[PDB]
Amino acid sequence: AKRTKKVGITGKYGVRYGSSLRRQVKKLEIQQHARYDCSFCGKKTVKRGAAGIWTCSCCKKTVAGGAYTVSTAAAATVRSTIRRLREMVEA
Amino acid sequence: AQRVTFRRRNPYNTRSNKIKVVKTPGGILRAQHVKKLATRPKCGDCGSALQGISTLRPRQYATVSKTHKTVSRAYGGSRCANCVKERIIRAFLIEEQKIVKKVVKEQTE
Amino acid sequence: AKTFTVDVSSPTENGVFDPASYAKYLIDHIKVEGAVGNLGNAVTVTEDGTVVTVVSTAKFSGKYLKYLTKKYLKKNQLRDWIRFVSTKTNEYRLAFY
Amino acid sequence: AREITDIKQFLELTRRADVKTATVKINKKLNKAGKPFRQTKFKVRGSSSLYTLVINDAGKAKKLIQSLPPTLKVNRL
Amino acid sequence: RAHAQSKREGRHSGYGKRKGTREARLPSQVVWIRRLRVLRRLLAKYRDAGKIDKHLYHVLYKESKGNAFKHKRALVEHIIQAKADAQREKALNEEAEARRLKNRAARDRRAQRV
RNA sequence: UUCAAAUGAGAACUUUGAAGACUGAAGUGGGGAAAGGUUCCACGUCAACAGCAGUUGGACGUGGGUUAGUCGAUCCUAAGA
RNA sequence: AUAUGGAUUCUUCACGGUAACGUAACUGAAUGUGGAGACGUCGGCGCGAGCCCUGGGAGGAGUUAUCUUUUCUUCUUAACAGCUUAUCACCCCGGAAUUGGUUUAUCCGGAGAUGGGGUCUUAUGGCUGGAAGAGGCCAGCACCUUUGCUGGCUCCGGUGCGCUUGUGACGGCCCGUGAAAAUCCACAGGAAGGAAUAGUUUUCAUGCCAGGUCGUACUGAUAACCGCAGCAGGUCUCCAAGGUGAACAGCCUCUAGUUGAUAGAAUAAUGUAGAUAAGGGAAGUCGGCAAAAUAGAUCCGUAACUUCGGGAUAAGGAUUGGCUCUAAGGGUCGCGAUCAACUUAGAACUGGUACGGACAAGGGGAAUCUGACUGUCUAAUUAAAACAUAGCAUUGCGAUGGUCAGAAAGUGAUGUUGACGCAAU
Ligand SMILES: [K+]
Ligand SMILES: [Mg+2]
Ligand SMILES: [Mg+2]
Ligand SMILES: [Mg+2]
Ligand SMILES: [Mg+2]
Ligand SMILES: [Mg+2]
Ligand SMILES: [Mg+2]
Ligand SMILES: [Mg+2]
Ligand SMILES: [Mg+2]
Ligand SMILES: [Mg+2]
Ligand SMILES: [Mg+2]
Ligand SMILES: [Mg+2]
Ligand SMILES: [Mg+2]
Ligand SMILES: [Mg+2]
Ligand SMILES: [Mg+2]
Ligand SMILES: [Mg+2]
Ligand SMILES: [Mg+2]
Ligand SMILES: [Mg+2]
Ligand SMILES: [Mg+2]
Ligand SMILES: [Mg+2]
Ligand SMILES: [Mg+2]
Ligand SMILES: [Mg+2]
Ligand SMILES: [Mg+2]
Ligand SMILES: [Mg+2]
Ligand SMILES: [Mg+2]
Ligand SMILES: [Mg+2]
Ligand SMILES: [Mg+2]
Ligand SMILES: [Mg+2]
Ligand SMILES: [Mg+2]
Ligand SMILES: [Mg+2]
Ligand SMILES: [Mg+2]
Ligand SMILES: [Mg+2]
Ligand SMILES: [Mg+2]
Ligand SMILES: [Mg+2]
Ligand SMILES: [Zn+2]
Ligand SMILES: [Zn+2]
């Protein structure tokens, strides 16, 4: 059965701190506790250690990432920018 | 029931003051201080516990024969079997690729 | 089958004891399967004048025998002069003093 | 304390020439059938260890008692 | 000891003799662990003895992880009912097959002998 | 709290016995750390001290007592000096 | 320090296993690398130990008008050693969808599952040695002493959401990810040293010697410490039995300890502490201050409002003892046999309608002001609306810097820092 309508994981906080702050926290807690696809072994086994460290329970590979998600949009954009600059440099 | 006392002057429940209640041939309950448990030696490549290696406190390894501390293989009680095998395969394949790269460089010039 | 012997010679020869009544009390009061009196082919109490023998196939113990003997001595005001004492395993006697 | 089961090796132990004392202990055990067999423990005092040989046969025990060297301080009981 | 024997017989257990909650007296998690463990061990026993196959075992394993089974008796009657249903449906299959083939044999004989 | 005995010049208070109670194992139990420093124990012993008492005492007088390769310190480094 | 034995070597520095790895050994300098030391907290689950509970038996004791195969009590096994013993982990075979395995907790598998067969760590347990000769419990004796004997028995089980504790595999949490070093081992490497009327090996066994110095008594607190004292104050920690009960609550008890607080006699007023009270029910009072009422558990039922999480035990009802029964909920072995513990539900009967019978244990509701909340402070007259807080915003600063130290410095904090930072509001 669905136990809460909207609070989800932030039902641990009860009525405290304000609904907006609980919602903002909820989004990033879901992100930081999710399992992500490992780019090395292809399994959905990447979980966060401390903020910015994302380790695969299978293949034991750890990658530096965002505080609450494996890859920030800024990092993806930087990866694309560096790829473009490198391709221009090498060709 | 019989109650026990610490046998050392340390009265605090620290990591080095752990006790077990044992019954003696006198029929009485007595605390016996227990040493901290040993940690298994671990692979230097993957961190897993090394198979076939005795697990002792650090200085106890000076009091046991070589057989308890090693495994008859290329990295013994240092690296696990799978990590050693990966080292073998990587070394061989990378050396072969080095030869291939050298000849490709020589034949592309 | 287990055998339990009780040497009553000392109180008998000192005079204040009766082995026949002790054996009769044992037969009357030994319980079998909770019920008293049905020592049917499982418990035999026999008398020799100096040694009372109890041979048992049912549940029976030296502790139970001592319990019954102490009960008999208390009923007959015989304690403070007669002690039920084990000399060897399942061989007891009535020490008189 | 160490237990030994080889009779020849126990004899070598009694002859080790650092062993100066032994003790022959008699037990009254039951080997799971209720009859009281007689066990014999021969304990030779080595310098670092006490070696015990257990024989459950009184015949072999008497044979070894005879076979002990006459310089050993046998210490019956 | 006398009070313990009385409690074993079922006395001194009414609502006026209870002061902790039902969970405090016996955790529902403990009850659930006991029940799920007996169900899992019965399913393993049946699969290993061949009374059920591994596919029905997997279905029943998921169902037993779900509540879906009040006790070992409920699981056993469910398995018996499933096996009896399979028996009845296979019997009907065989009966229909036999009737079809026999009618077709009669028809073929009539045709080829006309 | 009580009864009796013993000791004593002297006993509500000492000792032994009996009885009645309590702490009720998060103790009024058994050990320790800091601190104290002999208070520990025995013998003798009551002027002072124990806000009554005292033959008793953590008192007074005189003595006895603390045994380690393995328990600690000692060694290591911590914040720091 | 050392000499034998063992091992090793004519293929000099061992063999066996496909492998995981095994072993009594089985060369190994510099140098390098790795491991151990070495690490949070909480939650459930598994296992162990000790304790608790309990059956049979072998003793001792208690009760015995009556009853009670009964009540109490002893029945124990150290460090160390050998063999053996795990979860996890790993190896070989094999190739998996009808996806399977599987935990209480949903993870795992073509990056090789399930399955079959193996390897390993030895927490831990078992057996044996230690070691019954010890300790325990008894009996029969002798007894002007030291006191001495003489014997017997010290056995075999069961149970668990039990308590305490150790541990394992996990899982939750973090803008928190939860010491260091001494020290010990291993590996890589291959310097060097190495055999045949013989060389090699004190990581195998046995053997020899030594281990200094200081502390060590006792209390550890309603009398050994501090508080002017033999002060109702304060002062860190370990062990922890039975019953009731959710319970380390309260109440009673076992082991152990204590019975110490100046006493005796009376029972006026006024007190201090504890209680009760007809009828009324806050009229008392600044004010319901104080007290009372409520209270456990089971079942029913639960409003406004709301940040949808709560409010909530809202409110408001009912029931509860004892006894005799009924039903359901398990293990193991081959439907049957056997073994085992509590929890739940129901029914009849029963009584001065009592029954969470002592103990223990919410009063509730409608609103306003105020501070969001948890938290913090005036030790010794103020606990609050004060402070803090998360959130919001502003400010400075790119290191030859901001802010702030220092008498000065070839001096410092932030800073093991770098704007998602530091500093100031
Ligand atoms: K090994
Ligand atoms: Mg090994
Ligand atoms: Mg509970
Ligand atoms: Mg639950
Ligand atoms: Mg007295
Ligand atoms: Mg009290
Ligand atoms: Mg009491
Ligand atoms: Mg004294
Ligand atoms: Mg005075
Ligand atoms: Mg005086
Ligand atoms: Mg005098
Ligand atoms: Mg003195
Ligand atoms: Mg030490
Ligand atoms: Mg060899
Ligand atoms: Mg497998
Ligand atoms: Mg604890
Ligand atoms: Mg001491
Ligand atoms: Mg002390
Ligand atoms: Mg104390
Ligand atoms: Mg003082
Ligand atoms: Mg209970
Ligand atoms: Mg009134
Ligand atoms: Mg009234
Ligand atoms: Mg009214
Ligand atoms: Mg008024
Ligand atoms: Mg008025
Ligand atoms: Mg007014
Ligand atoms: Mg009030
Ligand atoms: Mg209510
Ligand atoms: Mg309300
Ligand atoms: Mg506030
Ligand atoms: Mg104040
Ligand atoms: Mg105040
Ligand atoms: Mg404020
Ligand atoms: Zn991966
Ligand atoms: Zn590895």
Question: Where in chain D are the domains?
Answer: 1-77
* Residue among D39, D59, D42, D38 at smallest CA distance from D5: D42
Q: Do residues B54 and B76 both lie within one domain?
A: yes
Q: Do residues B33 and B49 both lie within one domain?
A: no
Q: Is B105 helix (H, G, I), strand (E, B) or coil?
A: helix
Q: Is C74 helix (H, G, I), strand (E, B) or coil?
A: helix
- Give the count of domains, chain B: 2
Q: What is the CA radius of gyration of chain A?
A: 17
Strand G bases near protein CB (under 7 Å) are 14-17, 19-27, 33-39, 44-46, 48-54, 56-66, 68-71, 74-82, 88-91, 98-109, 111, 119-124, 128-136, 138-140, 152-153, 161, 165-168, 172-177, 182-188, 203-209, 215, 236-241, 243-247, 296-299, 306-310, 319-332, 335, 342-346, 355-357, 372-373, 390-391, 420
- The DSSP output letter for B61 is G
Resolution (A): 2.0
Angle, alpha carbons B71-B72-B73 (nearest 5°): 95
- Give the count of domains, chain C: 1
Q: Is A65 helix (H, G, I), strand (E, B) or coil?
A: coil
CA of A63 to the centre of ligand 26 (A): 79
Separation between Cα atoms, residue B105 and residue B39, nearest integer Å: 50
Separation between Cα atoms, residue B1 and residue B9, nearest integer Å: 24
B10 touches strand F (CB under 7 A): yes
Experimental method: cryo-EM
Nucleotide nearest to D47 (CA to C1'): G207
One DSSP character per residue, A3-54 reads --SS-GGGGGGTT-S-HHHHHHHHHHHHHHHS-B--TTT-SS-EEESSTTEE
Phi-psi region for residue B68, left (φ > 0), alpha (ψ -120 to 50) or beta? alpha
Separation between Cα atoms, residue D13 and residue D51, nearest integer Å: 8
Beta strands D2-4; D50-55: pairing state: parallel
CA dihedral sign, ordered E45, E50, E54, E58: negative
Q: Do residues B79 and B107 both lie within one domain?
A: yes
Q: Is E109 exposed, middle or buried (0-12, 13-18, 19+ CB in 10 A)?
A: exposed
Size (chain A), residues: 91
Q: Do residues B44 and B71 both lie within one domain?
A: yes
Q: Is B56 helix (H, G, I), strand (E, B) or coil?
A: coil
* Token code pair at residue D8: 């020849």
CA of A10 to the centre of ligand 30 (A): 25
CA/C1' separation B14–G41 (Å): 17
Q: Do residues B105 and B74 both lie within one domain?
A: yes
Nucleotide nearest to A32 (CA to C1'): G174
Phi-psi region for residue B96, left (φ > 0), alpha (ψ -120 to 50) or beta? alpha
Angle, alpha carbons D50-D55-D58 (nearest 5°): 130
Q: Is C35 helix (H, G, I), strand (E, B) or coil?
A: strand
Q: In what order do the strands lie in the sheet with C82-88?
A: C43-47, C51-56, C2-7, C91-96, C82-88
Q: Is C32 exposed, middle or buried (0-12, 13-18, 19+ CB in 10 A)?
A: middle
A69 touches strand G (CB under 7 A): no
CA distances from D77 to C41, D25, D56, D64, D69 (A): 48, 5, 16, 15, 18
CA of B100 to the centre of ligand 8 (A): 94
Cβ < 7 Å from strand G, E residues 72-111: 72-73, 76
CA of E15 to the centre of ligand 7 (A): 30
Q: Is C41 exposed, middle or buried (0-12, 13-18, 19+ CB in 10 A)?
A: exposed
Q: Is C66 exposed, middle or buried (0-12, 13-18, 19+ CB in 10 A)?
A: middle
Neighboring chains of B (3 or more beta-carbon pairs < 8 A): none
* Residue among C5, C4, C19, C7 at smallest CA distance from C94: C7
Maximum pairwise Cα distance, chain D:
41
Q: Do residues B28 and B43 both lie within one domain?
A: no
Judge contact between B77 and B70, C-beta under 8 A: yes
Q: Do residues B44 and B90 both lie within one domain?
A: yes
Which domain covers residue B58, as residue numbers? 38-109
Separation between Cα atoms, residue E10 and residue A31, nearest integer Å: 54
* Token code pair at residue B102: 């050298």
Contacts 24+ apart (CB under 8 A), C75-84: C75/C25, C76/C21, C78/C11, C78/C16, C78/C17, C81/C11, C81/C16, C82/C11, C82/C17, C84/C6
Neighboring chains of E (3 or more beta-carbon pairs < 8 A): none
Q: Provide CB contacts within 8 A for C78, sequence distance 6+.
A: C11, C16, C17, C72
Separation between Cα atoms, residue D19 and residue C96, nearest integer Å: 55
B28 touches strand F (CB under 7 A): no
CA/C1' separation C80–F11 (Å): 39
Q: How many C-beta atoms surround the C-beta of residue A65 within 10 A?
A: 18
CA dihedral sign, ordered A28, A34, A37, A39: positive
Q: Do residues B50 and B84 both lie within one domain?
A: yes
* Token code pair at residue C48: 């020799």
* Token code pair at residue D64: 């070894």
Separation between Cα atoms, residue E96 and residue E98, nearest integer Å: 5
Q: Do residues B49 and B98 both lie within one domain?
A: yes
B57 touches strand F (CB under 7 A): no
Which domain covers residue C25, as residue numbers? 1-97
Secondary structure of chain D in HEC code, one letter for each residue: CEEECCHHHHHHHHCCCCCCEEEEEEECCECCCCCECCEEEEEEECCCCEEEEEECCHHHHHHHHHHCCCCCCCCEC
**Buried/exposed code over A24-48 (b: 16+ C-beta within 10 A; e: otherwise):** eebeebeebeeebebeeeeeebbbb
Rounded to 5 degrees, φ, ψ at A70 are: -60, -40
- The DSSP output letter for B41 is P
- Please list the residues that pair with C36 across neighbouring strands: C31
